[PDB]
PDB file of C-alpha atoms and ligand atoms in Angstrom:
ATOM      1  CA  UNK A   1     166.285 -52.395 -81.862  1.00  0.00           C
ATOM      2  CA  UNK A   2     166.238 -52.958 -85.700  1.00  0.00           C
ATOM      3  CA  UNK A   3     166.963 -49.797 -87.760  1.00  0.00           C
ATOM      4  CA  UNK A   4     165.742 -49.474 -91.381  1.00  0.00           C
ATOM      5  CA  UNK A   5     167.708 -47.017 -93.578  1.00  0.00           C
ATOM      6  CA  UNK A   6     165.168 -45.664 -96.090  1.00  0.00           C
ATOM      7  CA  UNK A   7     165.984 -43.336 -98.968  1.00  0.00           C
ATOM      8  CA  UNK A   8     163.393 -41.099-100.689  1.00  0.00           C
ATOM      9  CA  UNK A   9     164.232 -40.480-104.400  1.00  0.00           C
ATOM     10  CA  UNK A  10     162.561 -38.872-107.434  1.00  0.00           C
ATOM     11  CA  UNK A  11     162.481 -35.690-109.528  1.00  0.00           C
ATOM     12  CA  UNK A  12     162.632 -32.278-107.878  1.00  0.00           C
ATOM     13  CA  UNK A  13     159.210 -30.994-106.739  1.00  0.00           C
ATOM     14  CA  UNK A  14     157.458 -34.431-106.526  1.00  0.00           C
ATOM     15  CA  UNK A  15     156.999 -34.086-102.713  1.00  0.00           C
ATOM     16  CA  UNK A  16     159.965 -36.068-101.204  1.00  0.00           C
ATOM     17  CA  UNK A  17     160.486 -33.455 -98.436  1.00  0.00           C
ATOM     18  CA  UNK A  18     156.715 -33.048 -97.801  1.00  0.00           C
ATOM     19  CA  UNK A  19     156.289 -36.884 -97.525  1.00  0.00           C
ATOM     20  CA  UNK A  20     159.305 -37.165 -95.178  1.00  0.00           C
ATOM     21  CA  UNK A  21     158.137 -34.288 -92.880  1.00  0.00           C
ATOM     22  CA  UNK A  22     154.552 -35.696 -92.944  1.00  0.00           C
ATOM     23  CA  UNK A  23     155.897 -39.176 -91.890  1.00  0.00           C
ATOM     24  CA  UNK A  24     158.216 -37.724 -89.168  1.00  0.00           C
ATOM     25  CA  UNK A  25     156.318 -34.692 -87.748  1.00  0.00           C
ATOM     26  CA  UNK A  26     152.653 -35.322 -88.819  1.00  0.00           C
ATOM     27  CA  UNK A  27     152.412 -31.904 -90.578  1.00  0.00           C
ATOM     28  CA  UNK A  28     152.203 -30.878 -94.232  1.00  0.00           C
ATOM     29  CA  UNK A  29     154.770 -28.256 -95.328  1.00  0.00           C
ATOM     30  CA  UNK A  30     153.896 -25.793 -98.119  1.00  0.00           C
ATOM     31  CA  UNK A  31     157.635 -25.250 -98.729  1.00  0.00           C
ATOM     32  CA  UNK A  32     160.903 -26.868 -97.741  1.00  0.00           C
ATOM     33  CA  UNK A  33     164.213 -25.708 -99.290  1.00  0.00           C
ATOM     34  CA  UNK A  34     164.461 -27.920-102.478  1.00  0.00           C
ATOM     35  CA  UNK A  35     168.295 -28.048-102.175  1.00  0.00           C
ATOM     36  CA  UNK A  36     168.504 -29.523 -98.630  1.00  0.00           C
ATOM     37  CA  UNK A  37     169.371 -33.198 -98.170  1.00  0.00           C
ATOM     38  CA  UNK A  38     168.783 -34.285 -94.545  1.00  0.00           C
ATOM     39  CA  UNK A  39     168.066 -37.459 -92.642  1.00  0.00           C
ATOM     40  CA  UNK A  40     165.496 -37.967 -89.819  1.00  0.00           C
ATOM     41  CA  UNK A  41     164.993 -40.707 -87.212  1.00  0.00           C
ATOM     42  CA  UNK A  42     161.631 -41.938 -85.908  1.00  0.00           C
ATOM     43  CA  UNK A  43     160.691 -44.798 -83.528  1.00  0.00           C
ATOM     44  CA  UNK A  44     157.559 -46.652 -84.775  1.00  0.00           C
ATOM     45  CA  UNK A  45     155.636 -49.953 -84.441  1.00  0.00           C
ATOM     46  CA  UNK A  46     155.224 -51.846 -87.698  1.00  0.00           C
ATOM     47  CA  UNK A  47     153.360 -55.177 -87.535  1.00  0.00           C
ATOM     48  CA  UNK A  48     153.878 -55.430 -83.736  1.00  0.00           C
ATOM     49  CA  UNK A  49     157.652 -54.900 -83.978  1.00  0.00           C
ATOM     50  CA  UNK A  50     159.188 -51.714 -82.558  1.00  0.00           C
ATOM     51  CA  UNK A  51     161.859 -50.314 -84.884  1.00  0.00           C
ATOM     52  CA  UNK A  52     163.820 -47.242 -85.871  1.00  0.00           C
ATOM     53  CA  UNK A  53     163.221 -45.595 -89.234  1.00  0.00           C
ATOM     54  CA  UNK A  54     166.247 -43.629 -90.485  1.00  0.00           C
ATOM     55  CA  UNK A  55     165.001 -41.709 -93.512  1.00  0.00           C
ATOM     56  CA  UNK A  56     167.171 -39.833 -95.973  1.00  0.00           C
ATOM     57  CA  UNK A  57     165.331 -37.131 -97.900  1.00  0.00           C
ATOM     58  CA  UNK A  58     167.412 -36.657-101.135  1.00  0.00           C
ATOM     59  CA  UNK A  59     167.944 -33.235-102.822  1.00  0.00           C
ATOM     60  CA  UNK A  60     168.784 -34.514-106.340  1.00  0.00           C
ATOM     61  CA  UNK A  61     171.549 -34.696-108.974  1.00  0.00           C
ATOM     62  CA  UNK A  62     173.155 -31.292-108.065  1.00  0.00           C
ATOM     63  CA  UNK A  63     175.826 -32.784-105.692  1.00  0.00           C
ATOM     64  CA  UNK A  64     178.923 -35.070-105.860  1.00  0.00           C
ATOM     65  CA  UNK A  65     178.448 -38.492-107.427  1.00  0.00           C
ATOM     66  CA  UNK A  66     180.345 -39.880-104.397  1.00  0.00           C
ATOM     67  CA  UNK A  67     177.523 -38.514-102.092  1.00  0.00           C
ATOM     68  CA  UNK A  68     174.732 -40.073-104.261  1.00  0.00           C
ATOM     69  CA  UNK A  69     176.630 -43.407-104.538  1.00  0.00           C
ATOM     70  CA  UNK A  70     177.180 -43.333-100.721  1.00  0.00           C
ATOM     71  CA  UNK A  71     173.477 -43.073 -99.849  1.00  0.00           C
ATOM     72  CA  UNK A  72     172.493 -45.625-102.520  1.00  0.00           C
ATOM     73  CA  UNK A  73     175.004 -48.117-101.012  1.00  0.00           C
ATOM     74  CA  UNK A  74     173.990 -47.384 -97.339  1.00  0.00           C
ATOM     75  CA  UNK A  75     170.219 -47.266 -98.075  1.00  0.00           C
ATOM     76  CA  UNK A  76     168.393 -50.585 -97.504  1.00  0.00           C
ATOM     77  CA  UNK A  77     165.181 -49.552 -99.273  1.00  0.00           C
ATOM     78  CA  UNK A  78     164.084 -46.828-101.694  1.00  0.00           C
ATOM     79  CA  UNK A  79     160.872 -44.848-102.141  1.00  0.00           C
ATOM     80  CA  UNK A  80     160.780 -43.990-105.881  1.00  0.00           C
ATOM     81  CA  UNK A  81     158.514 -40.949-105.950  1.00  0.00           C
ATOM     82  CA  UNK A  82     156.734 -39.282-108.875  1.00  0.00           C
ATOM     83  CA  UNK A  83     153.782 -36.802-108.789  1.00  0.00           C
ATOM     84  CA  UNK A  84     150.467 -37.977-110.395  1.00  0.00           C
ATOM     85  CA  UNK A  85     150.127 -34.515-112.114  1.00  0.00           C
ATOM     86  CA  UNK A  86     153.677 -34.658-113.667  1.00  0.00           C
ATOM     87  CA  UNK A  87     154.356 -37.162-116.508  1.00  0.00           C
ATOM     88  CA  UNK A  88     158.046 -36.149-116.700  1.00  0.00           C
ATOM     89  CA  UNK A  89     158.480 -37.197-113.032  1.00  0.00           C
ATOM     90  CA  UNK A  90     156.849 -40.614-113.882  1.00  0.00           C
ATOM     91  CA  UNK A  91     159.140 -41.009-117.000  1.00  0.00           C
ATOM     92  CA  UNK A  92     162.174 -40.316-114.662  1.00  0.00           C
ATOM     93  CA  UNK A  93     161.462 -43.302-112.327  1.00  0.00           C
ATOM     94  CA  UNK A  94     163.415 -45.817-114.485  1.00  0.00           C
ATOM     95  CA  UNK A  95     166.527 -43.519-114.210  1.00  0.00           C
ATOM     96  CA  UNK A  96     166.416 -43.667-110.340  1.00  0.00           C
ATOM     97  CA  UNK A  97     165.779 -47.472-110.333  1.00  0.00           C
ATOM     98  CA  UNK A  98     168.718 -48.031-112.786  1.00  0.00           C
ATOM     99  CA  UNK A  99     171.164 -45.867-110.722  1.00  0.00           C
ATOM    100  CA  UNK A 100     170.260 -47.726-107.458  1.00  0.00           C
ATOM    101  CA  UNK A 101     170.686 -51.166-109.165  1.00  0.00           C
ATOM    102  CA  UNK A 102     174.146 -50.095-110.572  1.00  0.00           C
ATOM    103  CA  UNK A 103     175.448 -48.841-107.177  1.00  0.00           C
ATOM    104  CA  UNK A 104     174.051 -51.811-105.194  1.00  0.00           C
ATOM    105  CA  UNK A 105     175.171 -54.325-107.919  1.00  0.00           C
ATOM    106  CA  UNK A 106     171.869 -56.222-107.305  1.00  0.00           C
ATOM    107  CA  UNK A 107     168.750 -56.999-109.370  1.00  0.00           C
ATOM    108  CA  UNK A 108     166.708 -57.316-106.145  1.00  0.00           C
ATOM    109  CA  UNK A 109     166.708 -54.080-104.106  1.00  0.00           C
ATOM    110  CA  UNK A 110     163.721 -53.345-101.754  1.00  0.00           C
ATOM    111  CA  UNK A 111     161.757 -50.507-103.427  1.00  0.00           C
ATOM    112  CA  UNK A 112     158.217 -48.961-103.508  1.00  0.00           C
ATOM    113  CA  UNK A 113     156.769 -46.933-106.398  1.00  0.00           C
ATOM    114  CA  UNK A 114     155.017 -43.838-104.957  1.00  0.00           C
ATOM    115  CA  UNK A 115     152.583 -41.643-106.880  1.00  0.00           C
ATOM    116  CA  UNK A 116     152.324 -38.524-104.728  1.00  0.00           C
ATOM    117  CA  UNK A 117     149.952 -35.432-104.804  1.00  0.00           C
ATOM    118  CA  UNK A 118     146.951 -37.821-105.255  1.00  0.00           C
ATOM    119  CA  UNK A 119     144.754 -35.069-103.649  1.00  0.00           C
ATOM    120  CA  UNK A 120     145.197 -32.966-106.897  1.00  0.00           C
ATOM    121  CA  UNK A 121     142.310 -33.219-109.439  1.00  0.00           C
ATOM    122  CA  UNK A 122     144.482 -32.663-112.541  1.00  0.00           C
ATOM    123  CA  UNK A 123     145.893 -36.200-112.929  1.00  0.00           C
ATOM    124  CA  UNK A 124     148.211 -36.806-115.949  1.00  0.00           C
ATOM    125  CA  UNK A 125     149.415 -40.316-114.783  1.00  0.00           C
ATOM    126  CA  UNK A 126     146.769 -43.111-114.309  1.00  0.00           C
ATOM    127  CA  UNK A 127     146.902 -45.709-111.490  1.00  0.00           C
ATOM    128  CA  UNK A 128     146.873 -48.416-114.276  1.00  0.00           C
ATOM    129  CA  UNK A 129     150.086 -47.046-115.998  1.00  0.00           C
ATOM    130  CA  UNK A 130     151.879 -46.812-112.593  1.00  0.00           C
ATOM    131  CA  UNK A 131     150.707 -50.361-111.501  1.00  0.00           C
ATOM    132  CA  UNK A 132     152.022 -51.818-114.819  1.00  0.00           C
ATOM    133  CA  UNK A 133     155.446 -50.129-114.258  1.00  0.00           C
ATOM    134  CA  UNK A 134     155.663 -51.358-110.600  1.00  0.00           C
ATOM    135  CA  UNK A 135     154.573 -54.929-111.652  1.00  0.00           C
ATOM    136  CA  UNK A 136     157.440 -55.169-114.200  1.00  0.00           C
ATOM    137  CA  UNK A 137     159.880 -54.253-111.343  1.00  0.00           C
ATOM    138  CA  UNK A 138     158.238 -56.697-108.929  1.00  0.00           C
ATOM    139  CA  UNK A 139     157.591 -53.890-106.394  1.00  0.00           C
ATOM    140  CA  UNK A 140     154.443 -52.415-104.713  1.00  0.00           C
ATOM    141  CA  UNK A 141     152.698 -49.231-105.994  1.00  0.00           C
ATOM    142  CA  UNK A 142     151.087 -46.829-103.484  1.00  0.00           C
ATOM    143  CA  UNK A 143     149.340 -43.500-104.155  1.00  0.00           C
ATOM    144  CA  UNK A 144     149.990 -40.858-101.476  1.00  0.00           C
ATOM    145  CA  UNK A 145     149.138 -37.291-100.526  1.00  0.00           C
ATOM    146  CA  UNK A 146     151.617 -35.524 -98.261  1.00  0.00           C
ATOM    147  CA  UNK A 147     148.849 -32.833 -97.961  1.00  0.00           C
ATOM    148  CA  UNK A 148     146.043 -35.085 -96.551  1.00  0.00           C
ATOM    149  CA  UNK A 149     148.373 -37.895 -95.109  1.00  0.00           C
ATOM    150  CA  UNK A 150     146.526 -40.463 -97.315  1.00  0.00           C
ATOM    151  CA  UNK A 151     148.803 -43.497 -97.904  1.00  0.00           C
ATOM    152  CA  UNK A 152     151.895 -41.840 -96.258  1.00  0.00           C
ATOM    153  CA  UNK A 153     152.398 -44.410 -93.410  1.00  0.00           C
ATOM    154  CA  UNK A 154     151.385 -47.202 -95.843  1.00  0.00           C
ATOM    155  CA  UNK A 155     154.163 -46.237 -98.338  1.00  0.00           C
ATOM    156  CA  UNK A 156     156.951 -46.152 -95.704  1.00  0.00           C
ATOM    157  CA  UNK A 157     155.658 -49.289 -93.842  1.00  0.00           C
ATOM    158  CA  UNK A 158     155.296 -51.215 -97.168  1.00  0.00           C
ATOM    159  CA  UNK A 159     158.981 -50.367 -97.896  1.00  0.00           C
ATOM    160  CA  UNK A 160     159.958 -51.674 -94.358  1.00  0.00           C
ATOM    161  CA  UNK A 161     157.983 -54.919 -95.149  1.00  0.00           C
ATOM    162  CA  UNK A 162     159.917 -55.263 -98.438  1.00  0.00           C
ATOM    163  CA  UNK A 163     163.234 -54.957 -96.478  1.00  0.00           C
ATOM    164  CA  UNK A 164     162.068 -57.572 -93.896  1.00  0.00           C
ATOM    165  CA  UNK A 165     160.999 -59.831 -96.875  1.00  0.00           C
ATOM    166  CA  UNK A 166     164.444 -59.406 -98.544  1.00  0.00           C
TER     167      UNK A 166
HETATM  168  N1  LIG B 201     148.766 -30.738-103.144  1.00  0.00           N
HETATM  169  C1  LIG B 201     149.912 -31.309-102.772  1.00  0.00           C
HETATM  170  N2  LIG B 201     151.040 -30.587-102.772  1.00  0.00           N
HETATM  171  C2  LIG B 201     152.123 -31.309-102.394  1.00  0.00           C
HETATM  172  C3  LIG B 201     152.176 -32.640-102.037  1.00  0.00           C
HETATM  173  N3  LIG B 201     153.476 -33.011-101.735  1.00  0.00           N
HETATM  174  C4  LIG B 201     154.172 -31.920-101.919  1.00  0.00           C
HETATM  175  N4  LIG B 201     153.420 -30.848-102.314  1.00  0.00           N
HETATM  176  C5  LIG B 201     153.928 -29.507-102.628  1.00  0.00           C
HETATM  177  O1  LIG B 201     154.778 -29.615-103.752  1.00  0.00           O
HETATM  178  C6  LIG B 201     155.889 -28.702-103.625  1.00  0.00           C
HETATM  179  C7  LIG B 201     157.187 -29.471-103.752  1.00  0.00           C
HETATM  180  O2  LIG B 201     157.274 -30.440-102.689  1.00  0.00           O
HETATM  181  P1  LIG B 201     158.687 -30.862-102.033  1.00  0.00           P
HETATM  182  O3  LIG B 201     158.484 -31.676-100.798  1.00  0.00           O
HETATM  183  O4  LIG B 201     159.537 -29.675-101.773  1.00  0.00           O
HETATM  184  O5  LIG B 201     159.340 -31.721-103.206  1.00  0.00           O
HETATM  185  P2  LIG B 201     160.802 -32.330-103.360  1.00  0.00           P
HETATM  186  O6  LIG B 201     161.637 -31.438-104.270  1.00  0.00           O
HETATM  187  O7  LIG B 201     160.563 -33.756-103.942  1.00  0.00           O
HETATM  188  O8  LIG B 201     161.348 -32.429-101.943  1.00  0.00           O
HETATM  189  C8  LIG B 201     155.668 -27.933-102.318  1.00  0.00           C
HETATM  190  O9  LIG B 201     155.044 -26.675-102.557  1.00  0.00           O
HETATM  191  C9  LIG B 201     154.775 -28.881-101.515  1.00  0.00           C
HETATM  192  O10 LIG B 201     153.970 -28.272-100.509  1.00  0.00           O
HETATM  193  C10 LIG B 201     150.955 -33.406-102.044  1.00  0.00           C
HETATM  194  O11 LIG B 201     150.822 -34.602-101.756  1.00  0.00           O
HETATM  195  N5  LIG B 201     149.864 -32.643-102.430  1.00  0.00           N
HETATM  196  C1  LIG B 202     164.926 -29.022-107.364  1.00  0.00           C
HETATM  197  C2  LIG B 202     165.991 -29.769-106.579  1.00  0.00           C
HETATM  198  C3  LIG B 202     167.283 -29.000-106.480  1.00  0.00           C
HETATM  199  O1  LIG B 202     167.442 -27.908-107.022  1.00  0.00           O
HETATM  200  N1  LIG B 202     168.213 -29.595-105.705  1.00  0.00           N
HETATM  201  C4  LIG B 202     169.480 -29.123-105.398  1.00  0.00           C
HETATM  202  N2  LIG B 202     169.891 -27.971-105.962  1.00  0.00           N
HETATM  203  C5  LIG B 202     171.122 -27.564-105.626  1.00  0.00           C
HETATM  204  C6  LIG B 202     171.964 -28.250-104.778  1.00  0.00           C
HETATM  205  C7  LIG B 202     171.417 -29.455-104.251  1.00  0.00           C
HETATM  206  N3  LIG B 202     170.195 -29.903-104.581  1.00  0.00           N
HETATM  207  C8  LIG B 202     172.219 -30.343-103.339  1.00  0.00           C
HETATM  208  C9  LIG B 202     173.344 -29.567-102.686  1.00  0.00           C
HETATM  209  N4  LIG B 202     174.097 -28.779-103.677  1.00  0.00           N
HETATM  210  C10 LIG B 202     175.318 -28.214-103.089  1.00  0.00           C
HETATM  211  C11 LIG B 202     176.456 -29.205-103.037  1.00  0.00           C
HETATM  212  C12 LIG B 202     176.811 -29.815-101.839  1.00  0.00           C
HETATM  213  C13 LIG B 202     177.857 -30.725-101.790  1.00  0.00           C
HETATM  214  C14 LIG B 202     178.530 -31.071-102.948  1.00  0.00           C
HETATM  215  C15 LIG B 202     178.165 -30.494-104.151  1.00  0.00           C
HETATM  216  C16 LIG B 202     177.122 -29.580-104.196  1.00  0.00           C
HETATM  217  C17 LIG B 202     173.337 -27.742-104.396  1.00  0.00           C
HETATM  218  C1  LIG B 203     144.896 -39.559-102.488  1.00  0.00           C
HETATM  219  C2  LIG B 203     144.051 -40.266-103.519  1.00  0.00           C
HETATM  220  C3  LIG B 203     142.576 -40.032-103.317  1.00  0.00           C
HETATM  221  O1  LIG B 203     142.139 -39.119-102.623  1.00  0.00           O
HETATM  222  N1  LIG B 203     141.798 -40.896-103.982  1.00  0.00           N
HETATM  223  C4  LIG B 203     140.411 -40.877-103.967  1.00  0.00           C
HETATM  224  N2  LIG B 203     139.771 -39.925-103.260  1.00  0.00           N
HETATM  225  C5  LIG B 203     138.433 -39.983-103.276  1.00  0.00           C
HETATM  226  C6  LIG B 203     137.705 -40.912-103.978  1.00  0.00           C
HETATM  227  C7  LIG B 203     138.503 -41.882-104.671  1.00  0.00           C
HETATM  228  N3  LIG B 203     139.843 -41.854-104.671  1.00  0.00           N
HETATM  229  C8  LIG B 203     137.883 -42.966-105.507  1.00  0.00           C
HETATM  230  C9  LIG B 203     136.426 -43.158-105.151  1.00  0.00           C
HETATM  231  N4  LIG B 203     135.727 -41.862-104.987  1.00  0.00           N
HETATM  232  C10 LIG B 203     135.550 -41.138-106.259  1.00  0.00           C
HETATM  233  C11 LIG B 203     134.993 -41.988-107.372  1.00  0.00           C
HETATM  234  C12 LIG B 203     135.790 -42.362-108.448  1.00  0.00           C
HETATM  235  C13 LIG B 203     135.277 -43.147-109.469  1.00  0.00           C
HETATM  236  C14 LIG B 203     133.964 -43.561-109.429  1.00  0.00           C
HETATM  237  C15 LIG B 203     133.160 -43.193-108.371  1.00  0.00           C
HETATM  238  C16 LIG B 203     133.668 -42.404-107.351  1.00  0.00           C
HETATM  239  C17 LIG B 203     136.197 -40.963-103.920  1.00  0.00           C
HETATM  240 MG1  LIG B 204     163.026 -31.672-101.038  1.00  0.00          MG
END
């Protein structure tokens, strides 16, 4: 069956691990070692087609450039994650997008902009600002909460749809 290699990227603390564990195991984790970079496989049905999701949960810049270039080359689609209560994490998105584009040597890479922690009242990044950034990239924007599950399946399935559309 078709396998989609998905990579979750974004600043430390945005909720990459929490989103991944919520997608895979259907539980919210209050803590997951921020330094651990692991991959997980799940069989799912997306738009009536049974497929394998192979998801790499990235740890960040504190590892060999050869490791980061390897997963950016192998990865078919990227979840670019920021937290809605962290403007610095939103400002960082363009850095992740740029690095993926360089490695893949392509102006058209399947990606989804994800604004996580949408359950938190203290928003510092508006939906409008995020939608404008995603529109300029020609990619979807989805707000998620790894805590409540809101938008979690939608964000990963939208990225699979972008790969199928590619
Ligand atoms: N309220 C809330 N907390 C979250 C959410 N996602 C992650 N967290 C918390 O934010 C912290 C960092 O999340 P983590 O998955 O480790 O981020 P990572 O460094 O991107 O992997 C942890 O304490 C998580 O429980 C979310 O959607 N809502
Ligand atoms: C907040 C995110 C964070 O601190 N991430 C993080 N910190 C330290 C490390 C890593 N991520 C990734 C793994 N390295 C160890 C390593 C492994 C192989 C090659 C070089 C470095 C530490
Ligand atoms: C994860 C994001 C999330 O929980 N969003 C969200 N939760 C509850 C509400 C809304 N979004 C929007 C609509 N209402 C609140 C509201 C906002 C503006 C005007 C009227 C009502 C519930
Ligand atoms: Mg993590």
